[PDB]
Design a protein around this nucleic acid. Structure first.
Ligand SMILES: [Mg+2]
Ligand SMILES: [Mg+2]
Ligand SMILES: [Mg+2]
Ligand SMILES: [Mg+2]
Ligand SMILES: [Mg+2]
Ligand SMILES: [Mg+2]
Ligand SMILES: [Mg+2]
Ligand SMILES: [Mg+2]
Ligand SMILES: [Mg+2]
Ligand SMILES: [Mg+2]
Ligand SMILES: [Mg+2]
Ligand SMILES: [Mg+2]
Ligand SMILES: [Mg+2]
Ligand SMILES: [Mg+2]
Length: 71
RNA sequence: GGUUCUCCCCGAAAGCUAUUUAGGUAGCGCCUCGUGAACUCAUCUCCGGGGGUAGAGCACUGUUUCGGCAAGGGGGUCA
């Protein structure tokens, strides 16, 4: 009867909402520590960056060639 | 610098490694949630082990104080 309809158990998961008091658990720093590049807005680092060490996908040598006949 | 409602469960780290790196970041180490298997792990008993630290010692590496024998050396004496 329209108002009687409810979803399955565990279907909806609420979702994390950050910065909303202490009781919320997460709140004041939205689960992202104190300071550093990761805490800052637009933070983090690009994909495959090991902090100036030459990343795995450059220290290893490239190999082979893509065949046109294989496609 | 600041990041706003509430209860319940578990709960770190400030280490290694690398870095124009050192107040940053990454992988591992430590937290957590989830998913499966073996007596898997922990505590203590009685066995098997390797070590070369504490201590001790002076054959060796050097160092060191005495006493006994003593080549070899330092002072003297000749035609
Ligand atoms: Mg939550
Ligand atoms: Mg929470
Ligand atoms: Mg918390
Ligand atoms: Mg702050
Ligand atoms: Mg800090
Ligand atoms: Mg941080
Ligand atoms: Mg460099
Ligand atoms: Mg440190
Ligand atoms: Mg420490
Ligand atoms: Mg550092
Ligand atoms: Mg810095
Ligand atoms: Mg010692
Ligand atoms: Mg000793
Ligand atoms: Mg002694």
């Amino acid at each position: 009867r329209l108002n009687t309809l409810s979803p399955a158990e565990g279907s909806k998961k609420a979702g994390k909402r950050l910065g909303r008091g202490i009781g919320s658990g997460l709140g004041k720093t939205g689960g992202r520590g104190h300071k550093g590049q990761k805490s800052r807005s637009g933070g983090g680092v690009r994909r495959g960056f090991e902090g100036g060490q030459m990343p795995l996908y450059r220290r290893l040598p490239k190999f082979g060639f893509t065949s046109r006949k294989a496609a």
